[PDB]
Design a protein around this motif. Structure first.
Motif, PDB file in Angstrom:
ATOM      1  N   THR A 102     -19.948   6.269   1.426  1.00 38.03           N
ATOM      2  CA  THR A 102     -19.319   6.745   0.197  1.00 38.03           C
ATOM      3  C   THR A 102     -18.546   5.624  -0.504  1.00 38.03           C
ATOM      4  N   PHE A 103     -18.170   5.859  -1.759  1.00 39.98           N
ATOM      5  CA  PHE A 103     -17.192   5.021  -2.443  1.00 39.98           C
ATOM      6  C   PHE A 103     -15.918   5.835  -2.656  1.00 39.98           C
ATOM      7  N   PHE A 147      -6.137  12.277   6.956  1.00 40.37           N
ATOM      8  CA  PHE A 147      -7.365  12.315   6.153  1.00 40.37           C
ATOM      9  C   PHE A 147      -7.722  11.056   5.346  1.00 40.37           C
ATOM     10  N   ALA A 148      -6.742  10.203   5.059  1.00 42.86           N
ATOM     11  CA  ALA A 148      -6.995   9.025   4.231  1.00 42.86           C
ATOM     12  C   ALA A 148      -7.401   7.800   5.052  1.00 42.86           C
ATOM     13  N   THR A 149      -8.225   6.940   4.458  1.00 43.53           N
ATOM     14  CA  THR A 149      -8.656   5.713   5.121  1.00 43.53           C
ATOM     15  C   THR A 149      -8.875   4.587   4.119  1.00 43.53           C
ATOM     16  N   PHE A 150      -8.968   3.360   4.625  1.00 44.03           N
ATOM     17  CA  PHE A 150      -9.423   2.227   3.826  1.00 44.03           C
ATOM     18  C   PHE A 150     -10.804   1.773   4.308  1.00 44.03           C
ATOM     19  N   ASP A 151     -11.839   2.261   3.641  1.00 43.14           N
ATOM     20  CA  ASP A 151     -13.215   1.965   4.026  1.00 43.14           C
ATOM     21  C   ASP A 151     -13.658   0.618   3.461  1.00 43.14           C
ATOM     22  N   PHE A 211       0.820  -1.202   0.000  1.00 42.76           N
ATOM     23  CA  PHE A 211       0.000   0.000   0.000  1.00 42.76           C
ATOM     24  C   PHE A 211       0.860   1.260   0.000  1.00 42.76           C
ATOM     25  N   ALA A 233      -9.232   4.448  -1.530  1.00 43.83           N
ATOM     26  CA  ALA A 233      -9.222   3.099  -0.981  1.00 43.83           C
ATOM     27  C   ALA A 233      -9.307   2.053  -2.096  1.00 43.83           C
ATOM     28  N   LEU A 234     -10.181   2.282  -3.072  1.00 40.23           N
ATOM     29  CA  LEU A 234     -10.352   1.321  -4.154  1.00 40.23           C
ATOM     30  C   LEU A 234      -9.099   1.214  -5.026  1.00 40.23           C
ATOM     31  N   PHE A 243       1.837   2.670   3.318  1.00 39.75           N
ATOM     32  CA  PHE A 243       0.776   2.671   4.320  1.00 39.75           C
ATOM     33  C   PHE A 243       0.751   1.394   5.147  1.00 39.75           C
ATOM     34  N   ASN A 274     -17.254   1.850   6.881  1.00 39.52           N
ATOM     35  CA  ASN A 274     -17.685   3.244   6.879  1.00 39.52           C
ATOM     36  C   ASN A 274     -16.664   4.050   7.681  1.00 39.52           C
ATOM     37  N   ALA A 320     -16.783   0.460   1.079  1.00 36.34           N
ATOM     38  CA  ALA A 320     -16.517   0.696  -0.334  1.00 36.34           C
ATOM     39  C   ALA A 320     -15.790  -0.489  -0.982  1.00 36.34           C
ATOM     40  N   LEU A 321     -14.843  -1.093  -0.267  1.00 34.99           N
ATOM     41  CA  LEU A 321     -14.130  -2.238  -0.815  1.00 34.99           C
ATOM     42  C   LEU A 321     -15.074  -3.432  -0.989  1.00 34.99           C
ATOM     43  N   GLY A 364      -2.588  -0.498  -5.765  1.00 38.30           N
ATOM     44  CA  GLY A 364      -1.520  -0.235  -4.813  1.00 38.30           C
ATOM     45  C   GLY A 364      -1.123   1.233  -4.753  1.00 38.30           C
ATOM     46  N   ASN A 401     -15.158   6.742   7.608  1.00 37.74           N
ATOM     47  CA  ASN A 401     -15.341   8.155   7.920  1.00 37.74           C
ATOM     48  C   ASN A 401     -15.827   8.329   9.363  1.00 37.74           C
ATOM     49  N   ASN A 419     -14.301  11.283   1.979  1.00 36.26           N
ATOM     50  CA  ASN A 419     -14.731  11.960   3.197  1.00 36.26           C
ATOM     51  C   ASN A 419     -14.585  13.481   3.113  1.00 36.26           C
ATOM     52  N   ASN A 437     -10.526  10.274  -1.757  1.00 33.68           N
ATOM     53  CA  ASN A 437     -10.577  10.742  -0.373  1.00 33.68           C
ATOM     54  C   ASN A 437     -11.971  11.303  -0.119  1.00 33.68           C
TER      55      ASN A 437
END
Ligand SMILES: [Co+2]
Ligand SMILES: [Co+2]
Ligand SMILES: [Mg+2]
Ligand SMILES: [Mg+2]
Ligand SMILES: [Mg+2]
Ligand SMILES: [Mg+2]
Lengths: 206, 207
Positions: B145-146, A143-147, A11, B150-151, A14, A118, A150-151, B157, A120, B120, B118
């Motif tokens: 959200t999508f 600010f970044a995440t792995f939701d 990642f 992340a996707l 990350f 989720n 969505a995946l 990667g 957020n 959010n 991003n």
């Protein structure tokens, strides 16, 4: 060191950490944080992802914290129960960050990123808890995440945790859901499955 | 009606709309919204995803908004420029919601979900503008959200928009980046590709 580096390199630096939080509401700035669980990950030599370490704390509602009964009714937490063993938000996050910052040291790793369903929601509560506690050394990306919602949408066509887990071929016990520990466990397993499945299908490497 | 149910059906009812905003800072509550673009999607008879409709509005700073020069320096927008054609936040959103609500009317769909890099960030500014304008009837899911960051992390990667797009095989032009239209556009194509690639490798359908 290697397996934590191979993970991060997957990642682009990350270091993914699965988080789940219980709260007294939907407002991260005004409603209490009540529970937090964290699960770190690792990559085996074959390049497969899996759960590594687990931390979990009950959290004392901070002073001034609002509490929605609909929230308590939902997750069943009683902020009053003596045998609860709640600590301060500071204590909970400090211990988690300490474990995470060590991860980031053994590094092709640069920064940690939160994995949550989720995300957020969980992210904002964590950032808010850290805010109140005045923690300067926060290892998570601001600010970044792995939701995983969505995946899961992508890989499974489901955005609900339970349905996503079921659809993925995972065990899911509604009776254990809405608990920080169980939810984080299922979420980390779901996250690892989606990633691995992508690997098994030849989507990765590129 | 067909392409919207198929699309929606792929995401258990969710009608994915790609959104990108430009702002005067990072605080959705207190900083100005300056720009918004929206791209709807559609699914063809073969089950592939692609961009459908596109709208775009420059937005006038709401009264009380702060503007960070670093934000303006970053995106290049002058909120005082007379020929921007800036509209109120109520107007931009109302127009976008109108088009989205029209999509949700399709039998398969029941709610829109925002697609964003991003997400959010964009979602919070969108929700705050809607709040300022007292807009009922917001077709977008209030907390889901999508997120393409992340996707793209999973699929490619990469988490950075430009990096992910390049890594995906798409053209990316740093010249046109950080503009609502262009960014929404690259973002929509990136989302469609990740979904399509998933399909083309046999991850979907589940059968
Ligand atoms: Co706290
Ligand atoms: Co506005
Ligand atoms: Mg949760
Ligand atoms: Mg939970
Ligand atoms: Mg953006
Ligand atoms: Mg942009």
């Amino acid at each position: 060191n290697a397996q934590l580096t191979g993970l991060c390199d997957r990642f682009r630096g990350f270091y993914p950490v699965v988080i789940d939080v219980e709260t007294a509401g939907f407002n991260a700035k005004t409603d209490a944080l009540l529970e937090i669980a964290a699960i770190t990950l690792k990559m085996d030599e074959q390049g497969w992802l899996m759960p590594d370490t687990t931390l979990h704390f009950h959290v004392e509602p901070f002073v001034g914290a609002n509490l929605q009964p609909e929230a308590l009714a939902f997750n069943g937490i009683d902020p009053n129960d003596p045998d609860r063993g709640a600590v301060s938000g500071y204590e909970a996050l400090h211990e988690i960050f300490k474990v995470v910052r060590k991860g980031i040291k053994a590094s092709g790793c640069n920064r940690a990123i939160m994995v949550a369903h989720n995300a957020n929601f969980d992210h904002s509560f964590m950032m808010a808890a850290a805010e109140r506690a005045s923690l300067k050394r926060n290892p998570f990306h601001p600010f970044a995440t792995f939701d995983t919602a969505a995946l899961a949408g992508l890989a499974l066509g489901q955005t609900v945790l339970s349905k996503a887990c079921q659809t993925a071929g995972m065990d899911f016990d509604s009776t254990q859901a809405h608990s920080a520990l169980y939810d984080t466990e299922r979420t980390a397993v779901l996250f690892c499955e989606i990633v691995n499945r992508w690997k098994r299908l030849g989507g990765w490497p590129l």
